RNA sequence: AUAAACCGACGGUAUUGUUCAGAUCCUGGCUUGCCAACAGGAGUUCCCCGCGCCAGCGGGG
């Protein structure tokens, strides 16, 4: 579960080793984080998971509560309260709606994860150029990012796949903060401010599936349906043990 | 053994056809190259040779 477990990846704000913490640790301490991962955009995709989390658990009241939460860390009381009524929707294994997937996936073939490594395949020269074997076993962490990437950033794997909600790759761009946590904080919209952007079904695509060649109008989206998004049918494999993430 | 390694940007293709540079036109007038002068001096020629009066005369290279 994104919201209790630990998958995501750090290291000190200038010091050294990685670690993978939680969602608690990050907003419950004066620790200085900053994202660590071995590509860039990927860095980009788990702070925008990690944002779009933020703004559907803490959005804050007002500009004044909004530059409170910034300088001081909220309590763990505080955050497991945010989180409760949300853990149900950020499973990855799960029984009916697994985090930005599809129960029921009919398909002859098993994908390769590389399919959702964003520029390590999409092209004839690929397989010439880069490196063989980035994908043949992901962690949890990289998976769930992976997953966020292809649904907003990247291109659809082909015909009859469709791309994100802003079209095929926009370019994000987020406030750019001292360390992980206030960055994170710094792209929250507050709650005057989420209601004047979103004036529904707000229910995710993958608790609430999209209907097949079914017309929707783009106001008839909740912001929860429209951040986490989800315009494929992704089904995960049953993973495998311990060792490394390629 | 380095975003490295392995690794063609490739294949075909007339720039062609036409066209006086042409008519007229002194380079022209003047102007010593000039003064002096034995082609004479100087016998080296290195050999072989034959005949002398020892001075010098000959034939071969």
């Given at each position: 579960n994104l919201l209790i477990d630990n998958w995501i990846p750090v290291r000190p704000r200038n010091g050294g080793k990685v670690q993978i913490i939680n969602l608690q640790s990050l907003y419950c301490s004066?620790?200085?984080?900053?994202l660590s991962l071995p590509r860039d955009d990927m860095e980009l995709a788990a702070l925008a998971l990690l944002?779009?989390?933020?703004?559907?658990?803490?959005?804050?009241?007002?500009?004044?509560?909004?530059?409170?939460?910034?300088?001081?860390?909220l309590t763990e009381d505080e955050?497991?309260?945010?989180?409760?009524?949300?853990?149900?929707?950020f499973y990855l294994n799960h029984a009916e709606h697994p985090f930005?997937?599809?129960?029921?996936?009919?398909?002859?073939?098993?994908?390769?994860?590389?399919?959702?490594?964003?520029?390590?395949?999409?092209?004839?020269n690929c397989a010439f150029v880069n490196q063989p074997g980035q994908g043949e076993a992901l962690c949890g962490g990289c998976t769930?990012?992976?997953?966020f990437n292809q649904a907003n950033q990247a291109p659809g794997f082909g015909g009859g796949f469709k791309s994100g909600l802003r079209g095929g790759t926009?370019?994000?761009?987020?406030?750019?903060?001292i360390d992980l946590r206030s960055t994170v904080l710094l792209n929250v919209l507050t709650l005057p401010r989420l209601q004047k952007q979103f004036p529904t079904e707000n229910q995710p695509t993958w608790i609430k599936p999209i209907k097949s060649n079914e017309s929707i109008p783009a106001s008839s989206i909740g912001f929860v349906r429209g951040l986490?998004?989800?315009?494929?049918?992704?089904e995960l494999c049953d993973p495998i043990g311990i060792?490394?993430?390629s």
């Open positions: 004066r620790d200085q984080w900053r944002v779009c989390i933020g703004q559907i658990i803490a959005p804050a009241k007002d500009d004044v509560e909004f530059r409170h939460r910034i300088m001081n860390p955050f497991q309260q945010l989180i409760a009524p949300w853990i149900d929707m930005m997937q599809t129960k029921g996936v009919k398909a002859n073939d098993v994908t390769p994860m590389e399919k959702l490594l964003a520029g390590v395949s999409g092209a004839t769930a990012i992976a997953l926009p370019v994000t761009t987020f406030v750019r903060g986490f998004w989800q315009p494929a049918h992704i060792g490394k993430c």
